[model samples]
Target chain A: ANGEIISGFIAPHPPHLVYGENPPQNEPKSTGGWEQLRWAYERARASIEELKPDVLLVHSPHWITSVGHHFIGVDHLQGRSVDPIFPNLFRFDYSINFDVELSEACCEEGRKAGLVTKMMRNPRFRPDYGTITTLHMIRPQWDIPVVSISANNTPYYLSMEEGLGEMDVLGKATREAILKSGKRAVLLASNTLSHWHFHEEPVPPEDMSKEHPQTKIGYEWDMRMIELMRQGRMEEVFQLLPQFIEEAFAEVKSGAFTWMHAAMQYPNLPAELHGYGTVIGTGNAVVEWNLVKAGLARVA
Target chain B: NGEIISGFIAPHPPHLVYGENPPQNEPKSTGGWEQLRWAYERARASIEELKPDVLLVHSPHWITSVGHHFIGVDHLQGRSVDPIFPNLFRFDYSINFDVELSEACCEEGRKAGLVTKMMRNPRFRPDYGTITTLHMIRPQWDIPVVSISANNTPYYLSMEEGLGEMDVLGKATREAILKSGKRAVLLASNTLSHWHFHEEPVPPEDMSKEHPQTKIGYEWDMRMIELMRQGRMEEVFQLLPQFIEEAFAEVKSGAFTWMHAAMQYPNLPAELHGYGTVIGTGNAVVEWNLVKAGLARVA
Candidate 1:
């Protein structure tokens, strides 16, 4: 097929499914080491089996680098197993090999289309939680080789100007990658939705009294944002207020606006697309996309 | 210390004195500027009778600069008391100049860590709310004036910060009095409820029918009182947007400068002194006076 199908999914990372066992309900804690390692393996195996492809491109909202450089992993590199502060956390042993040859070809195609593209090598930096969770789910067997892609360069805490530029670059790169990759490849944009205020159940009376039915409004706002993406209008997304009032009002939350930009840029990709969205108790969402088409289109 | 003490809050009607007319879609006034002038004269007579030493003035119109800007003048110069109103109705008077006392008070405020600047311009004129109130309250005594500016902090500070600042100002005033060996009275100049009066509508008669008894005006007044009573000026800061929403719902468009001023000083004892339609402008005021010191100490 000349064009690849693109689909999106939002899934819940059930504590047991991603962390190996149900996390303690009283406080925030990382999953125990072996269980988490096993869970990652299982996730990765299932992802590869379900959507077999030659290359895997992942986008993480959490991996913030600079505002202009996308941190793509280099091949045959090894680093520390995990963050030392979180001992029970599973460390990644395998090198996150970036398909630079394919990435470069894609970058050239994007440049021809009047876009800026840059390649980055981070030998020491380890994969963040978003990438690790997604890689484990998609390549559980450790047999399917995967390549990692970083998000558009943007400061996470500041305003959205840098983020908008980052999304534009990523979209251009993704489209070019699909055009040049002769083998079947899956471009998986990993993203999450909304970080709601956390409070335990048997909620305090004051909390109950303060419950704003505004959460529903936030969801509707998210739906509106997705619709904007589906229509491929990236500029319009910038109009979202800094106060996030619309999102706050609708309670439709996500950290996926950047990913949405990438998805919109590659409108030509026609692959089997799947979307899974889940709301964890803390008002966070895990969304995943899988493109299931392989090979170039036969010229009619 | 002087035993006689009195304070009153009155609106500085934007149209009646300041020349900025209300929106031109309200009711026509039965009694316009002429009636307002008479009321102002009567109020001025009462102030003159009191003959207080220092006019402890609190004005909502004073722009609280990046730092506090206090009006430290015994005799306010360039008394264009009623610039817009006709000279026949204008009230002009001079009181004692007390720059020394005002500066000493400001120094006390500074010692309390509340930054303050003094207005020393030759032509620094007081608005009708300040001038008219002064003309009516103490026309004969050009007592040293200590003015407080409106807090214009961009990002709203917490209630403690706001109240703490006011308390510091109060303590400074008390200390200045003790050191200067002079008796002083506190005056809070303000207005409440800013709904439009008659004579504003294009036809100048539809206001009574179309805009009378707006819930926004009443609710705004009540909300201010509630916040002050609850000692929740911080909450008031958070609710400002809501207040603006209500104001827009009523007039569709009007300045929010007055309401913002009212919210800044929430701890002082406030009394709604006057409310009426003056030349198509709804005007009201609240008096805030510090409680008796001995009573406070006993409590």
Candidate 2:
């Protein structure tokens, strides 16, 4: 079968994670986040394994690019990851297959999109919280091939629009290359929305038993945005996309630009918003796009 | 020629740090790694004593192809160290950046034709050069850092021109410090001669000895260390062609162009703190007093 966007997500890379030991389903019968994460990631795991796409792709907000986009063009990747703030509960080891041939096509097509790209071969290059948290949480079997890219956070390039347009072009190429590689893949737009919330005292990432308070507006905007996505109202989502970086304290205005562009190429796929919550002060949510068709699908 | 309160060169090696049996290390001590560890401790103590207001780092590990300097402007906050070299580096960091000073330094560079710009989407993650050195120097993250990249232009030249525009970067930096109101520390985060075995990547944990091609680099490192000790500034500059020449010699090369440019800082008298090697590459940790021995400018 020709390749298609099997499934995707827009998740948070907060201090919480499930290392092989456990990113967090923790002790003290803990904070509100445990149940939310368990529920959210549980859906994510089921959908991922259900589709079990041959390759997985992500444009993590954490693995950022300054001048150009990154096409994780490597033979393989193995890492021992830890949360920068709290390493105790959120450290893990896992390895995965890198879709080398498909990534090369992405690389070639990326240059086709007028961008400079690096083919990262070194395992020490490291994956950020966005990656291991979401992917490992979903499934860390390391048997599936993973293709990851970073958002180009251009300050003010040929104006911001031109850079993003070029970014969209690279996403388009990823689609073309995926089909050409003949491997079904999932796109993980690994990011959180509405990031301006903060805590007076720094909360250790492992503190699942407690959470920092956030603003009314922050929570409002996140739910509103998630609601819009559930309705498949992506055009409105696009209209609202550009300012989330300043508003959300996010990486690219939203990883949605990268992920949306790829999903747009697929057209009319069923989507789901599994769960949402607050981390410290930022809004955390898990949204999914499974590969099954709209009318002829098994409803979960 | 100078009021640069402090300047030093710290090597970025792939080995254990801060006395921990690193995740990557075998727990068995070896020659090259032990020597590197010794130097790291010495420089670590020196950095703590000064408590620099700002640390300006330049390393080859952060290079761009164009003739511009890439300054990291992110409000970097993190717990672990470099993702790739985790076990080897074993660093835990949480530090604030001196953005005002960083921008000030950027302004000075632009005025001098060595235009410096901010990295868009500047993530807090830094390269091995910054991470490896910072862990040893500012383990507690007390001092703030402003990182800069040594560009891809052929690192050496006979006189001032496009590639030579960077020669004045040292001055722009010193001026920025004076303008900022703190004794700034300049760190040339680099390795000496980089000629190592080419056929195979060194096993991640193997740091016992040098490869065959690295022998030339070792000799070159010894020579440079001697020149640095004797305070032979101009004499070292004269060795540029020879150093550049050997890079293409016998199937190996050295990544010292950044180190070479950093040495251009309006010449300062230096003190050699630590010197060692890893896999035949030479690494020296040296600090300067920022005296009157001004850097030579090509008119």
Candidate 3:
């Protein structure tokens, strides 16, 4: 990588699975999360499969560590998923390849670069809902060597001096490993944006779709973020990170915003907002980068 | 790392880099260049006889973050003055780095599940741990070189895990280089029992006239040299982690590569190419024959 990042993207992983045609009649075609971003999934699938990276690293918030960074350091891991409400909608049992060597390698690099780090040492440690969802949606075949990084309890908003985010340390570690291994890699920061919704059974809420006072701002935040990504204005996103904190306090699901502020520093790639759609009023984006032209000062 | 060919461990203080003879007035020793030169010459001769297509090395000094073994695959060209003691050493180096082979080896290491990687660009720079040894054996730098890292210490590098992965590392090196259709040599660019101290009447730190070797260091180096001579490598491997820890320097430097070469060869005859003490550290060059009594045979 020689300080070169192959590609990075933001993906929304709602538990409901995709490639669903058995009953296209099914309302919203499975879950609001999958149907909304199915086209975005399609948009990046071919590129990933074609490039065929040597490693695929995901910044997963589910495998949480309170003080330091953690890597999924096991040879193999099981990924099981089932939506509590609708078992039939999203349920699957499968195994995945976890390149713990590389996982440990990245974790090693993190600490050397002056960040707190550790390994998820549990052999039976199952990946969280957010992790498996992204892997299922991304490496559908489960063929590539995957390394899952945890979102730490340490938050950038919690800091006043604001030196560097743990995720940013992860970003540098991932880049160094890719370059040093002489292998191509893709880093995915997995989470949804501006997810403020009612947990009601019928799933009704006040202004999820631009209907209420608080909800309108949530919707606006999501839409504006997508536009910035489309124009490749990532620096602007960091500047506005504080606003997302406010939204989360207003009941918006914090889409691992700190993970974004930390990991999503793609200065070279001319990116695209592959697709964006509201699922239950939560803004989901399929933002992707063109790695072929990924070495120069920020295009944004 | 895994596909290890013939290799050995040697020390890397600036005093040894001047070849068999130094200014004599300022050898980092108590007049013990005799043993040092003998080992240097022997290891050098064996490597030349081997005529390896590439020389792979591991330097304890060339450390990387937690889990990786970073290889120097750079097309190297530079003049180096030992940063700490520019007064003692200055040398020019230019070599054709084996980037292609190293990358090929990295792929195999990954396949074998070893923590490994490469360095293609030169901005990363080669360190003295490598230059000190490589210059001694392959002075011309004619053979393309690939230098790997010993685990950075007091960090996440566990000696138990490090010892265990040697097998995986050795296998990866073995398969990759063979597939490349080229013979390779691994150089464990390091020394043993290296702890600086004043001399007698002064204290322990290398007090000018007489050399300093910790009684523990002396006992440790002698015992290992005997084990290496007998090719009792597995027994040695099992104890390496503990031995390295007990050593005052706390860095076994290049011992892992030689240990891997031994596992690769399985009872290949070991030779104590050279052994001596310089500045309280034991500088020993030991070699293991990796490909004859006919191991790399293909019909």
Candidate 4:
């Protein structure tokens, strides 16, 4: 299937996971921990292989831009990805070959859709930890060309309610770009759920002894969200989104989850839950929705 | 003697520029927030006398999540329009950056173990807060600038965490200036009380309609301002944590924290040039004369 998003995945990127795996690309070494979440990433990797997508288009929270949405404009980006908060746990070296044509198309479509959009053409620009961790875990080989989008956080400054509406429009633009380009694509929503987490980490970040959801209410909100996704009640999920974010301080407030779901046309098909666990008190889940399985896959 | 000569607490409310009706900005207004504008006018005179080699600014509007970032390019030009109040602010801008001092600050920041990087992208637009503060303080734009980004960790990780980082950044900034031996003026680009109106006036610059967002917030702002007036910045710093929570002060972005730290937590009272409300938020044009306070040179 060409010119369509064959699948979409909710890929949570917490640098602690990369540290836990002790990947060669990452600087930090740790005794393996957070296996429940890491193992789910293994399954996610397998699932991605099954989808056989040409490109991975990801919307990440870390690439936050104050001015409108942005696409990685350069053809290649290679630099060290450092975590501002958890630098000790994560400083990953990465090299990404961007699908520039598709990225530009997404930029064009975004502007056509009346969203403020720009192309980030700086070669020296480094990808944030969220972009690096999510992509590395899902496709460690660095084989798939990727398109990274920046999250516009101006609304946060303006006290606008979590700006998911903009993300919805951006998602539609992303879909238009994918349709216009003859490439099989998989959308990765790189965000955590129930965003609040421990301000400090354990001596060994991989030490899971202190790991748990930030609050019981936040945990409940995350579980309920996962349950709804399992039931394929996307419409209800979207409806509960604002409240969930308000109540739980969800990372989904980044709007990646909504963007991915919108790109998938709010599919009614049940999501495959690959894994779910907590990282430093924040809830994370590895999940996928297969368009091929739902018979919604489009061909060129 | 250290490079930093003085520090200024300049609040950036895009409405002020919109109201000023500057040619650089597209919007027109019938003069709103005159008190603050006049304060900026007074500040420009004082700043001009200093002959600062550079204006080192830490802007909350440049919300970088990954780490503290310095604008690395020599020349950057673009338009910065207010996303929320699009009609109120559409500013055409051009910036001349002091790459030498910018690199120095980045290196020192890294030395201080803070996550730091240089934003070398020419396409990256300056945030409205940076633009507003710089334009207000120095409309000529003759003095070169070293713009720094405010990391958004405090909103997520912890305010204390961000505050500590800003303090370290402040020290780093001081250290960089000292090493460079350039007369630098630090601009803490932050609003006093952040809680404000999400909507604009019908005319977008209707000063008659402008007022504080809430009485309680206004009172808290006054309490904080009174401390500054009394030169009790230590108390103001002490109240910042609670002030941020209670009044939703923009200090949460650590602009003040950084400036105070850069000033080595001065004991002198700040010269309050102007104090007023804009779009329901508290803004003050205040300056700390290090030389006047006998705290001009960094140790």
User: What do the candidate models score in CA lDDT, each in turn?
Assistant: 0.44, 0.58, 0.60, 0.83
Residue B241, model 4: lDDT of 91
Tens-place lDDT per residue, model 1, A1-300, is 244424333332222234332322112233221221232234334555655566665666556555443545365455534424332433444445566666665556556655455666656666665665565555544454454555544435454555455465655656556655665555555543433433532222111112211244443344444444444453564456343433543121223344443544433332211221222212223333344422232211
For model 2, how does the per-residue alpha-carbon lDDT over A110-196 read when each residue is reduced to its tens digit?
787677876777766776666766667667576777777766766343465666676677778787777677667777777777676
Name the lDDT value of residue B284 in candidate 4.
72
Q: Could you list the CA RMSD of all candidates, in the order they appear?
A: 25.5, 26.1, 27.6, 26.2
Rank by lDDT, descending? 4, 3, 2, 1
Docking model 1 quality class? incorrect
Superposed Cα deviation of residue B143, candidate 1 (Å):
93
Q: What is the lDDT of candidate 2?
A: 0.58
Q: Which digits, one per residue and each the tens of the lDDT, describe model 4 over residues B1-299?
A: 45577789888888788867888999787555554665687789788777788898988888887889999998999899888777778999999999999999999999999989998988989998899999999998899999999989889798788799899999999898888878889999988876788877676544435556765676677677658868887778788899899888888998888888987888787776666677778787788888656656432
Off by over 4 Å in 4: A159-162, A298-300, B1-299
Name the regions of candidate 2 deviating beyond 4 angstroms: A19-33, A155-159, A200-209, A250-257, A266-270, A295-300, B1-299
- Binned by DockQ into CAPRI classes (incorrect, acceptable, medium, high), candidate 2 is incorrect
Error of 3 at B275 (Å): 1.0
The best candidate in terms of TM-score: 4
Cα error, candidate 3, residue B163 (Å): 2.9
Off by over 4 Å in 3: A1-300, B1-5, B19-32, B69-74, B198-212, B249-265, B297-299
Return the TM-score for each candidate structure. Answer: 0.35, 0.45, 0.44, 0.50
Interface Cα RMSD per model, in Å? 23.6, 25.5, 37.0, 23.4
